[PDB]
Amino acid sequence: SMLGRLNHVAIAVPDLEKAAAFYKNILGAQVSEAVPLPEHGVSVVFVNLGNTKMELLHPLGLDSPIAGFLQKNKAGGMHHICIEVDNINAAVMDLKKKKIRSLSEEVKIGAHGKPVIFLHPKDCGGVLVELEQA
């Protein structure tokens, strides 16, 4: 099938250090060191749950894509899910053909250095969905 695995659940957090330490030292998760991603305006910590990852995100620089989310959601919150696709270009053409209003039109290189597209919550799906080339 075109649609694949859940690659990550992304959580925006107001304190990346504290969030990472909670998963690591309270819950006993496998947690990475923080990685700055300046191109993407965030810092990330990866929580490896074995089957998938949680990405803990915090703004990096004054123009972060998640800065506005953290003003609304001061305690942090679930920000998006990311599901893999076998072929992102075939997937974009298909979704364009289906004429869905949530499609974000332009394929960009995402935080993993692979092409992605975002579907906003505009067709009953209920969540921001990042689709990433597998």
**What is the DSSP code (8-state) at residue 89?**
H
Q: How far apart are CA 95 and CA 114, in angstroms?
A: 19
8 among the known binding-site residues? yes
Tokens of 110: 């995402």
User: Is 83 a binder of its own copies (CB under 8 A)?
Assistant: yes
* Residue with Cβ nearer Co ion (45 or 82): 82
Contact of residue 130 among Co ion, its own copies, none (CB under 5-8 Å per partner type): Co ion
| 130 is annotated as contributing to ligand binding | yes
* Angle at CA of residue 120, ends 118 and 125, nearest 5°: 115
Please report where in the chains the tokens 């659940």 appear, as a residue.
9
Least CB distance to its own copies at residue 39 (A): 23
Tell me if 52 sits within 8 A of 9, measured CB to CB.
yes
Cβ proximity of 5 and 84 under 8 Å: yes
Which residues of the chain form contacts with its own copies (CB under 8 A)? 1-6, 9, 11-15, 18-19, 21-23, 26-30, 49-52, 54, 56, 75-78, 81, 83, 95, 98, 100, 121, 123-127, 129
Residues annotated in a binding site? 8, 80, 130
Which residues of the chain form contacts with Co ion (CB under 5 A)? 10, 82, 130
Residues annotated in a binding site for Co(2+)? 8, 80, 130
